[PDB]
Every structure is written in structure tokens, then in C-alpha cells.
Design a binder for this molecule. Structure first.
Ligand code: NA
Ligand code: NA
Length: 327
DNA sequence: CCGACGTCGCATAAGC
DNA sequence: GCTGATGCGA
DNA sequence: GTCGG
């Protein structure tokens, strides 16, 4: 796991990944290329041949070939071509705006809209989400230092508690695992009055409060259980102002809360391992529940959970700190 | 050879 | 107006 | 594109 060891190769794979997703609309080729990129990124030798790479889970014949060409010429003909392609490179770029995905990008570029500037000239053609995306294009591609996250957390936990001291809220994501930086803030929310069996107002009042103290500045989307929007730390005195940040707030019912918390803490890799484990011990785990099987594979009713540990207990695993859930 | 590859809440489209 | 498909982000 | 039934 050292940067420019196979950087050339993994930046390559990652470029191709984006073109598959954003231009070709082949999300599964997109994940193939990314998966290759990962397993190569972890590989602790400078790759010498496509054949050496092929040995890795997720590197097949086609990518092996690419690596050979890259290794001998320092570039890829296809990648070089698509990069200079006016239409395609503009479609790929436009998708960097939040709310513009591969379909809307494609339509824009069809009607000659290819640049941020062009988007600015055409706001009347953007939905609410997209306008927010444009407006904060740069801020949203910035990382969030952990210190700022802590500051944001102070504000979130404070105002949630002042709306109702019985609410529970957890900031998960790479934040909860110790990451020195985060992509956004992901808040998980529950209340003792909200169970799977069980007002239709619990998420709304929390969001309202966060707007009233001007933490939440914009709304991408909001319904009865998931909120997605924008936030910002209060500008220190005369100091330079903070970036607007992405924040999601999820209302989960209490008897599914720690499954939710477990799931949205990750990492993805650790989740795959633990869901694998898991089956072998006789259980199925998803973001909501842990259920038992079932001599024929028939899933029983969901078991009670009242903490993260509870889940680990069910499946013969000693509790592992968010600290140590890289895998 | 050929299908799976995560899933789902919310905004908006689109056909009725 | 209704519906439930499709795009999007996570 | 890669893996696997
Ligand atoms: Na292989
Ligand atoms: Na986007």
C-alpha cells in the first residue's frame, strides 16, 4: 500500500472506470475497473507484467492486456483517445456536479452544454438538486478535516439533544473509524418512540432545528426518514469562511438502529467479511436486521439487537472497535 | 456460455 | 390527478 | 470486465 508504486496503473484503471460509468452507462464495468484498481493498489510490489497482475482477484485477461500496453509505452491508446474526445470528456466532467448523473450529462452535452459556465448560463434547465451541485461544485470536491468534523459533530449532537434529550444520534462513516478526513457527514438518528412496529414528525424537527441555527444551509432531498442536504460551520470572527459540506441524516427505528450503525460504519470490505462470517455461523445480516436460518435456508424472524456488540455476540465474534474495521 | 455484479429513499419524469 | 418508472446518490 | 455455476 504505497502511492505511486502502481499509481500509473491505478489512475489508469480509475479513469476507465469513470468513462464506463459516466459515458458508457455500464455501472458493472465501472465497478470491475475500480475493484481491479483497489486490489492492485494494495499489492506491495511494482507490477512487472500483465500476467503478474492477472493473478489478482479482479484482474482479468482484458485488464492484463492494458497493463502490458501501459508498461511498454507509458500510456493507453484508448484512454488517450477518449480523453481528447470533446463530447465524451465533457459528459464525464459534467457528472462531477452532484445531481447530474450519466443520463442528464449526456442530454446536456447533446444540446451543447458542456462546461460549468454553460450550466451557469442555463440554470433554468437545472432541477433544484443540480443547482445546489453547481453552486457548490468546488466545495463538494473538498475533503473534510477530522477537526472540522468534530466541530460539526458538536453542533449536530448538541441541537439534536436540545430538540429532545431522548433522541439518539451517531456520526458514522469513515469518521467513526478514526479517519483523519471524511467525504461528508453521515448521521444516524433514532428515538425510543420509533420502532418497526410503531410521530410522522421526528426527522423534520431535527432538520428544522439545524436550519434555525444556520448549520444546515440547503436541501437536496427530504422525506419522512432520509434527509440529504448541505451544511457549514460558523465563520470565525473575521477569518476566512468554511466550505459548504454534504450531510445526510437518516431516521432508523430503534430495533434496527445498531444494525444501521454497524452497516454505515463499514468499511465495505469489513462488512463483506462480517456478512460472510455470519452466514457460516447460521445468520443473515443486512443493514436492517440479523436473522437466523433455517436448515433449508429459510430466514427466521429478526433477532433483538440493543448494541453493536449484541450483533457480534450472535455470530461468535469479539467486539471490534470502529477503530479496527478497515477489514 | 451466460447471468450477477447492493439496495433503496426521494425527486421528477412520463405515460395514463 | 394517479402511478410506479427512472435517475440519482449513498 | 471478471468471476463463477
Ligand atoms: Na484472474
Ligand atoms: Na454527479
Amino acid at each position: 500500500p504505497q502511492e505511486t508504486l502502481n499509481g500509473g496503473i491505478t489512475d489508469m484503471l480509475t479513469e476507465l472506470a469513470n468513462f464506463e460509468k459516466n459515458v458508457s452507462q455500464a455501472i458493472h464495468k465501472y465497478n470491475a475497473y475500480r475493484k481491479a484498481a483497489s486490489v492492485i493498489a494494495k499489492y506491495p510490489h511494482k507490477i512487472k507484467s500483465g500476467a503478474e497482475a492477472k493473478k489478482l482477484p479482479g484482474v482479468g485477461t482484458k485488464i492484463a492486456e492494458k497493463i502490458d500496453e501501459f508498461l511498454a509505452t507509458g500510456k493507453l491508446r484508448k484512454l488517450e483517445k477518449i480523453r481528447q474526445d470533446d463530447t465524451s470528456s465533457s459528459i464525464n466532467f459534467l457528472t462531477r456536479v452532484s445531481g447530474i448523473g450519466p443520463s442528464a450529462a449526456r442530454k446536456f452535452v447533446d444540446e451543447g452544454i458542456k462546461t460549468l459556465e454553460d450550466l451557469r448560463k442555463n440554470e433554468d434547465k437545472l432541477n433544484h438538486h443540480q443547482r445546489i451541485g453547481l453552486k457548490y461544485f468546488g466545495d463538494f470536491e473538498k475533503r473534510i478535516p477530522r477537526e472540522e468534523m468534530l466541530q460539526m459533530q458538536d453542533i449536530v449532537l448538541n441541537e439534536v439533544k436540545k430538540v429532545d434529550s431522548e433522541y439518539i444520534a451517531t456520526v458514522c462513516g469513515s469518521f467513526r473509524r478514526g479517519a483523519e478526513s471524511s467525504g461528508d457527514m453521515d448521521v444516524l438518528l433514532t428515538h425510543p418512540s420509533f420502532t418497526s412496529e410503531s410521530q410522522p414528525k421526528l426527522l423534520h424537527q431535527v432538520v428544522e432545528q439545524l436550519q434555525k441555527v444556520h448549520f444546515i444551509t440547503d436541501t437536496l432531498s427530504k422525506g419522512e426518514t432520509k434527509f440529504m442536504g448541505v451544511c457549514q460551520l460558523p465563520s470565525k470572527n473575521d477569518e476566512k469562511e468554511y466550505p459548504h459540506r454534504r450531510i445526510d441524516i437518516r431516521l432508523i427505528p430503534k430495533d434496527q438502529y445498531y444494525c444501521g450503525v454497524l452497516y454505515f460504519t463499514g468499511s465495505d470490505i469489513f462488512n463483506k467479511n462480517m456478512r460472510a462470517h455470519a452466514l457460516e455461523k447460521g445468520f443473515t445480516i443486512n443493514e436492517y436486521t440479523i436473522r437466523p436460518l433455517g436448515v433449508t435456508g429459510v430466514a427466521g424472524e429478526p433477532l433483538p439487537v440493543d448494541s453493536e456488540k449484541d450483533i457480534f455476540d450472535y455470530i461468535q465474534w469479539k467486539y471490534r472497535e470502529p477503530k479496527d474495521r478497515s477489514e
